[PDB]
Design a protein around this ligand. Structure first.
Ligand code: CA
Ligand code: CA
Ligand code: CA
Ligand code: CA
Ligand code: CL
Ligand code: CL
Ligand code: CL
Ligand code: CL
Lengths: 315, 315, 315, 315
């Protein structure tokens, strides 16, 4: 279609501009020290470069196994790879955590189901291979930023629900999430039209590529559609009033309240400054507010982990 | 206009040559060690990449707060960004100072007022957010090189004057400048025609883009026009007889004398060598003369700071 | 020939894609620490950049001489150079070994004989110059990956056989191989047609360029053709069921058994994961399975070396 | 001229190939550790990027001043800059020496006189500014490689001769050379036609551009033409039988013998290997033969320096 190939070309130009911004940022930014990484593991029998993951660890491990963080990167479902959030992942690992971050195939080559299947395959891989190399899968923090927060919010629900597992064509994995931390999530993509910005303007096209025309995906594209009826882990919602997607965070809180989700928040006020933009704590680990946000996340995780251990007579 | 687009194309080719020279220099130059930086903070609600700043600090801080240096880079008003003077800024930070350096929009997309507004917004940002992350704003060194020295000289006057604040559309910031150090400033751009070089030849075009046709800017483009009637901080004028803009420094001294400005100088004689070119102490921090110049600046600042503390019964 | 230049263009496009993958991997991968290298030694009187080698050593040597590892890189006979396996070579050196890795001219500019002559010239160079700079040539591990495993398997036979030396136009070198370790070798290239993949599909073209039309090369292209009648060193076969060339490893084992070759294996099962792809232990030294594989190789070498020293009344 | 612009284009293509080889080498080569450099000093009042120099020093200085090495790079008079020999210069500095290396304008934009004037201006600069930053100019080693060895051999003669100073339009500098070390020099360019290689084939064109049509330059292009009648420092001739310019070294020895020049040699035999190519000790500081060669040079220098100090009642 004329207009369709044009719409794709517009979306790809927006992400090419982002790409240049990301490259310029990483060329200058301080890198977290005292971390080791293992790169480019295939998580299935495929040569698709996106179906790969990275693992990150502190350079000196206190213990043979460390609590796990699993990161799902953002980029509007159309952009990104396992290296995009490398500095944020190194930061978390430097705090004493075993961290995994995966690639997933991008729209428009797959739809939302292909993305969810890729993520569940990376989790399944980790359930087989993680413990032997340092991952404690009894204590798992699942986190995602922006479109990655959308995906993380869906994965958290799918993991609890046999029906959603069938619809998305995945099996449950043999570990649970201790905490699910969403950073400026786009968890209600059907509301994208009522805000301003590039994604919101192009919204119907994003929604179409996410669903791939499958009405079952249309009916399960939003957290508010997959949350119903499930007993979920606790959530932590991170962001702020200077997030260009703040309306999404406001919408998500209402979904949380209506569904009796257990959550805490770290939402920065506008008064804390204009620099606390969309996903600032992921893009600039080194800023003081980013350190405060990220440590607050890890401390929430640790508190939930400790409670679980007391509960399981394993303190 | 035919000739106007041609004149712009000539100026941009000169700065593209400079750009290549700067890239080649930074690829080789020693980098100051033992410094941390925090990059790419937006200082207002904008995605304009120029409306961002960097912060620099010693890697090991003696104290929770350190005296402040705020750097305004040069580049003829048409060139540069927050990274241009990164090695010079790291050097100063390595001496035990909290340093901020800002981007500002470039001609011909803005005029002088837009540049001044950007600088005051970065200062305002720092007044809100700096102290919480290490900046002592009771002791502030404002410095600029070349066109950045012009801008610094204007900002120093505007900060003291309600009338100039109104004309430039800025509010005063809630800290003062302890010392204003100008390195090979172009503080009297209306005199650009009486010297030789690329900028001088293209002078009327520079002056036009600086004023943006606004006669109030034409009447306040030169330090000699904004200095009148104000009680100013002390100045330090750095440069030398091998500065291609030495005539500007000579002109500025006469303005200083006529207006009873408090100043000291560090002007290198021709006998100290041909390498002590325009802004040499900013471009090559590592040279012995650069270290001597830069430490002499920091020691002048420290002496003025100590006197202020004695005066304020806070030694 | 129309079709011939087309077939070459297809092979070169496949290797250009590999090349990009290799560059992306090396840009991110951790580098082994505590190693020194000496680069770009010519091993004959030639300015052909491929007729050069690198040497690698631990940064702090326990001893004046260290046991030797000699690495022959892969790349389908059409691709690669002395830098391709640099991280794998550094890893081995970091374990206390003096390592040499050579370039060799590539198809279609030479044929298999030119490749074998280049390798023997690098070995001859090392026999003249290695000991003076740290190589213990009484204990030598010869290793190759993929096409490099093919080449290593042939070199091991040629070194033992006056007749093959004459056919390949090389002289024996004045040291022996303690162990020959093949990593996912393509040691039976004539069987390439009975598997799937790029190389297998283009097989007849690979075989033609390897032989250069020389029927004596056609009759000695496969390990099974050069193994006959010789007393060989011990071999170690490394790979696994997720190697895209696993059928080659299966074929080689049958050749080993039929010819009473002394060997051990380190073949990973499919259950050990999809990431244990072709030559994974060479491409990602840092992974735990790679470390286990590579140390197991070095320990086999060390055990064979110790036995030799006991046998030679030199323990 | 048609043929002249063609000949220049051929020479520039040869040097562009060399340039790529040099870039590939520096991307991989180990860099000497524990050195500081100061870059891009202009040595005259010019913005010509070639009329600049670098200074190199050990990172921790034993003493306030260190013996001096001054390096003149090669590149056929048509190629190179102050960064070309940076690793070799760092190596020498790491041994406890203050090292200067200069750019000089390249053929065909200047002729030999312009090159000699640039070199003498860098020496004059150092005589004014070197001691204040660590250079001991009582003990000076002058070294050059290939075309840089030609230039060094001429500079050594010119410095001793009022007549050659007048012809080349330079003044003597206020220090002497303790030793002049030539590495694979092309000191008799008029003999270039009787060897093989790119430079030799294009020889008449090189000779024309060197002389710039000036018959006084034609009569003083060769060391054998400037050596006559002068009392010279001692020389050290470095190279070997695998230098593609070995015939030049053989020719120079005959000139040395005929003119009663004081010299020593470090000429490697062919038996020491094919890797000991033209200027190998400059291109690969890290090789054992390079370290041996370079330390032997520095020890010869030190011995000559000590003798001078005993002679001057200053031990
Ligand atoms: Ca544990
Ligand atoms: Ca303080
Ligand atoms: Ca030994
Ligand atoms: Ca001394
Ligand atoms: Cl790492
Ligand atoms: Cl940093
Ligand atoms: Cl190294
Ligand atoms: Cl340095």
């Amino acid at each position: 279609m004329a207009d369709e190939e044009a719409m794709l070309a517009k979306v790809q130009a927006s992400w090419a501009q982002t790409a240049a911004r990301d490259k310029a940022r990483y060329a200058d930014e301080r890198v977290p020290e005292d971390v080791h990484w293992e790169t480019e593991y295939r998580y299935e029998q495929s040569a698709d470069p996106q179906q790969t993951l990275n693992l990150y660890y502190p350079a000196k491990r206190r213990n043979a196994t460390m609590p796990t963080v699993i990161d799902i990167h953002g980029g509007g479902w159309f952009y990104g790879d396992r290296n995009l959030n490398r500095n944020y992942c190194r930061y978390l690992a430097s705090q004493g955590y075993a961290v995994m971050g995966m690639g997933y195939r991008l729209l428009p080559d797959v739809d939302l189901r292909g993305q969810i299947q890729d993520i569940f395959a990376s989790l399944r891989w980790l359930s087989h291979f993680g413990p032997q190399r340092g991952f404690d899968l009894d204590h798992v923090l699942l986190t995602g930023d922006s479109a990655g927060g959308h995906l993380a919010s869906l994965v958290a629900c799918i993991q609890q629900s046999a029906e959603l597992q069938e619809l998305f064509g995945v099996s449950r994995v043999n570990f649970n999430f201790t905490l699910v931390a969403l950073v400026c999530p786009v968890a209600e993509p059907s509301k994208l039209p009522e805000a301003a910005g590039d994604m919101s303007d192009m919204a119907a096209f994003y929604l179409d590529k996410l669903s791939g025309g499958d009405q079952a995906l249309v009916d399960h594209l939003n957290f508010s559609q997959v949350v119903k009826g499930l007993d979920l882990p606790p959530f932590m919602l991170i962001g702020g009033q200077n997030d260009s997607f703040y309306l999404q965070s406001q919408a998500l809180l209402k979904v949380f309240d209506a569904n009796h989700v257990t959550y805490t928040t770290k939402l920065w006020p506008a008064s804390a400054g204009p620099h606390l933009k969309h996903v600032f704590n992921v893009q600039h680990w080194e800023w003081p507010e980013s350190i405060e946000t990220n440590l607050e996340m890890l401390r929430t995780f640790d508190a939930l982990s400790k409670q679980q251990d007391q509960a399981e007579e394993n303190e």
